[PDB]
Amino acid sequence: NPDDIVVLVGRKKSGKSYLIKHYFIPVLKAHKISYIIDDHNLLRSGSEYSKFGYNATSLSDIVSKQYVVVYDRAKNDDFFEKLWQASKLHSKKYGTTVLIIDEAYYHFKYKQKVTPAIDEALHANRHAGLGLILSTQRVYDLMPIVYKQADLIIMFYTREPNELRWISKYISAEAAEKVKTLKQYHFLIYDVNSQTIKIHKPILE
Ligand SMILES: Nc1ncnc2c1ncn2[C@@H]1O[C@H](COP(=O)(O)OP(=O)(O)CP(=O)(O)O)[C@@H](O)[C@H]1O
Ligand SMILES: [Mg+2]
Ligand SMILES: [Mg+2]
Ligand SMILES: [Zn+2]
Numbered sequence: 001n002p003d004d005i006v007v008l009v010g011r012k013k014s015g016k017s018y019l020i021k022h023y024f025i026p027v028l029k030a031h032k033i034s035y036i037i038d039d040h041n042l043l044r045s046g047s048e049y050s051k052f053g054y055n056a057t058s059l060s061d062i063v064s065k066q067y068v069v070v071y072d073r074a075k076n077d078d079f080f081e082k083l084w085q086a087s088k089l090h091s092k093k094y095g096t097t098v099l100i101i102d103e104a105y106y107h108f109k110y111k112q113k114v115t116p117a118i119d120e121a122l123h124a125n126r127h128a129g130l131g132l133i134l135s136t137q138r139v140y141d142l143m144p145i146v147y148k149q150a151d152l153i154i155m156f157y158t159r160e161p162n163e164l165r166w167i168s169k170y171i172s173a174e175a176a177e178k179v180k181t182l183k184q185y186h187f188l189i190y191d192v193n194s195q196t197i198k199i200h201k202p203i204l205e
Contacts, residue, residue, distance in 0.1 A: 003126045005149055007142075008135040010156035015185045015198045015202070016135050017102060020153070022205050024133060025052060029067070029099045034094040036062060036087050037069045038080075039101040042157075047071045048102070062086040066094055072106070077115050080107040084117035091129035097106070104134040105141040112143065122149040139166045146170050153190045155184040155196065 002205065006024075010016035026104060028035055041048040053067035062068055063086055070184055072079055083099075091097045101107065101120075108118065122145060125132060136142050139155075147153060147170040155171075158164070159180050167176040174197055175190050185202030 001131070001151065002028070002031070002098060003129070003131045005125060005132045005146075005152040006134070006154065007146060007150045008133065008154045010105050010135075010137065010154075011135055011141050011158065011185070012065045015187070016154075016156060018185075019187070019203065020100065020102065020133065020135065021049075021052070023203050024098075027099055034066050034088060034090070034097045035068070035116055036097060036099050037085075038083060038099065038101040039069055039071050040075055042071070046191060047064075048061075059086045063089045063093060076107040076166035077107070077113065081115055081117040084121060088128050088129055096129050096131065096134060098131040100133045102135045104136050108134060108136075108146055110143055110144045112196070114143070114145075122146065139163045139171075144170045147192075153192060155179050155182075155190070157184075157186070157187045 007014055008016040008019060037052060039047045049069045053069040054061060054065040055072050056065060056068050058060050059082065062070060064145045070083065079155045087097065087099050120128060121132060134146060152198045155175065157179065164176045167179060172190055177186060178188055178197060178199065187200045189200055
């Protein structure tokens with residue numbers, strides 16, 4: 001489902017962005033589904049996702065360009081609110097769109113303020129015609145309501161006790177047990193709605 005909320009959790013170099021770049025993005029593009037990437041990581045030239053769409057420099061670009069990448073310099077509440085409004089208008093034009101947010105702790109941080117945009121993103125995304133892919137490094141980086149509102153939660157290896165406790169409490173105790181034994185680039189997929197778990201082999205490319 002293009003309007004699903006998907007959350008990816010994995011340590012640095014776990015393979016979560018690789019999953020976005022070589023599974024999610026290709027599948028979206030294959031089904032002719034548009035996306036907007038909120039990118040926080042600068043590279044030597046450009047940003048991490050520069051190759052994956054039009055590098056926007058105005059709000060107008062966000063609405064008009066079918067595949068769009070937004071480098072987020074301010075990384076604040078005001079920016080996400082503006083991006084969300086522009087994403088909704090983008091969705092009006094291009095139909096159901098996935099908003100991809102790497103390093104999502106900038107906008108959905110544990111104990112941060114829930115703006116109107118955040119509340120809408122997590123509760124009214126389908127009506128807004130927007131799916132979400134949210135990515136973070138530790139489970140406890142984000143507001144627990146993100147996991148309660150997700151449709152799919154993807155997790156790579158961890159045995160960190162606070163992480164396991166969060167997973168047990170807000171996601172699934174079965175997930176908390178199974179995440180401990182994942183090998184490199186293997187991942188667990190928890191379906192929040194069916195309460196089902198599948199272990200996935202590393203993706204090819
Ligand atoms: N399924 C897979 N098969 C082979 N190699 C993989 C893989 N998934 C990830 N890798 C390798 O691991 C490296 C790091 O992957 P990735 O960038 O997805 O993790 P990450 O997003 O957590 C790092 P960062 O914290 O910088 O964002 C990639 O350069 C890739 O070469
Ligand atoms: Mg990454
Ligand atoms: Mg130890
Ligand atoms: Zn951002």
